[PDB]
Design a protein around this nucleic acid. Structure first.
Lengths: 111, 52
DNA sequence: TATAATGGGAGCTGTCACGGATG
């Protein structure tokens, strides 16, 4: 269904705060922010989609995503809150795309 | 309002009640679509704590 | 890169036999 202004603003806000939380998690862990974003994205999408990312130096397989999710799970509370924020941010990005998929059709019919 | 404790003094044909009262007063806040509530239902907040 | 914009649009007009699907 289409979004009401409130739902739209809420989804966009969750996405932005999730990106910020991924940056903070890269600050804490010392890992690469792209690897962290890919692990969060994999866990939100599920094991149905796990493939190698070109920019990533490591072949993203469920064993490595489990290792990195364990490195993220072994964090204090005020640090693991960032992992929670990132997970919800990716989950919000998904629905933000899916909600506005209609606009793409209404624009592309003219090309 | 509820009366926690009650101190009384007798003087003449009257009693003067010192009441240790405790009560709650409402203050409504309006939320706009660009605002988000950062506080759950029935949570306790102090002076300085963020609600919206 | 920033107002808002949120589901398309043609189609255009055999004749038969056969094997498979359905009803």
């Amino acid at each position: 269904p289409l979004l009401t202004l409130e739902e739209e603003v809420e989804l966009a806000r969750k996405v932005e705060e999730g990106m910020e939380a991924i940056k903070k998690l890269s600050e804490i862990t010392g890992l690469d922010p792209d690897l962290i974003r890919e692990v969060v994205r994999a866990k939100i999408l599920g094991s149905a989609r796990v493939r190698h990312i070109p920019g990533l130096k490591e072949t993203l397989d469920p064993k490595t995503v489990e290792e990195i999710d364990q490195k993220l799970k072994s964090l204090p509370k005020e640090h693991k809150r960032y992992l929670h924020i990132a997970r919800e941010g990716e989950a919000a990005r998904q629905h933000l795309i899916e909600a506005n998929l209609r606009l793409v059709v209404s624009i592309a019919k003219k090309y | 309002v509820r009366a926690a404790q009650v101190e009384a003094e007798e003087e003449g044909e009257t009693v003067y009640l010192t009441l240790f009262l405790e009560w709650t007063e409402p203050k409504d806040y309006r939320v706009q679509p660009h605002m988000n509530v950062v506080v759950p239902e029935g949570a306790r907040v102090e002076a300085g704590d963020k609600i919206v």
